[PDB]
Amino acid sequence: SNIIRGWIFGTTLDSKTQSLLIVNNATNVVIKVCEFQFCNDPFLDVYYH
Amino acid sequence: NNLDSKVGGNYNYRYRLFRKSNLKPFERDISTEIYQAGSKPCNGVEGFN
Amino acid sequence: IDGYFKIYSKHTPINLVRDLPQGFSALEPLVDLPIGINITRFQTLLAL
Numbered sequence: 001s002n003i004i005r006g007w008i009f010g011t012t013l014d015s016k017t018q019s020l021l022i023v024n025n026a027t028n029v030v031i032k033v034c035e036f037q038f039c040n041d042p043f044l045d046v047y048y049h
Numbered sequence: 050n051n052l053d054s055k056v057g058g059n060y061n062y063r064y065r066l067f068r069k070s071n072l073k074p075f076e077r078d079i080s081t082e083i084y085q086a087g088s089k090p091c092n093g094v095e096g097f098n
Numbered sequence: 099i100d101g102y103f104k105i106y107s108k109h110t111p112i113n114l115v116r117d118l119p120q121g122f123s124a125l126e127p128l129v130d131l132p133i134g135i136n137i138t139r140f141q142t143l144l145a146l
């Protein structure tokens with residue numbers, strides 16, 4: 001039933017350096033390599049609303 | 050010269066002058082953060098050496 | 099490796115109870131992309 005979605009990879013994860021995003025939905029993938037600011041425990045859930 | 054030079058100097062062009070370790074092949078370090086030349090730890094934005 | 103990041107994968111159905119199953123097979127490569135970034139850490143994403 002496809003609970004798993006994607007992965008995150010980096011060195012510092014803190015926008016002082018670049019880091020990379022991998023994600024999935026019903027079929028598609030994006031990969032992106034910005035200086036992402038994340039959080040303590042971010043994720044993607046089913047954002048139904 | 051004939052397209053990238055400027056009479057006031059084309060100081061848009063910048064390069065890294067200091068690094069802890071020499072980079073790996075095809076690495077790209079975008080960090081603008083401070084470097085230490087004196088033995089003291091340095092914080093924020095400036096220091097002696 | 100040296101300017102590239104690359105991914106390999108496989109899928110199989112099984113009926114083993116509660117563990118990573120036995121048997122054998124190998125992963126096919128699915129993509130490569132030059133991110134050039136230094137990497138040291140990672141995480142995985144799941145939905146409610």
Ligand SMILES: *[C@@H]1O[C@H](CO)[C@@H](O[C@@H]2O[C@H](CO)[C@@H](O)[C@H](O)[C@H]2NC(C)=O)[C@H](O)[C@H]1NC(C)=O
Nearest residue numbers: 022023024025026027028029030031032044047
């Ligand atoms: C999976 O996610 C992507 C976006 O992350 C969706 O792609 C967009 O879909 C709409 C409608 O087809 C387009 O207007 C956008 O241009 C698409 N973006 C890109 C980058 O192509 C995609 O529709 C999602 N799929 C499902 C079924 O949820």
Ligand SMILES: *[C@@H]1O[C@H](CO)[C@@H](O[C@@H]2O[C@H](CO)[C@@H](O)[C@H](O)[C@H]2NC(C)=O)[C@H](O)[C@H]1NC(C)=O
Nearest residue numbers: 010011012069070071072073076078136137138
């Ligand atoms: C890739 O990123 C890692 C993590 O920032 C770097 O590892 C650090 O290296 C410096 C200098 O040797 C040390 O101060 C840190 O203690 C190291 N941390 C870890 C987790 O080992 C690594 O040097 C970077 N690689 C390159 C080629 O710049």
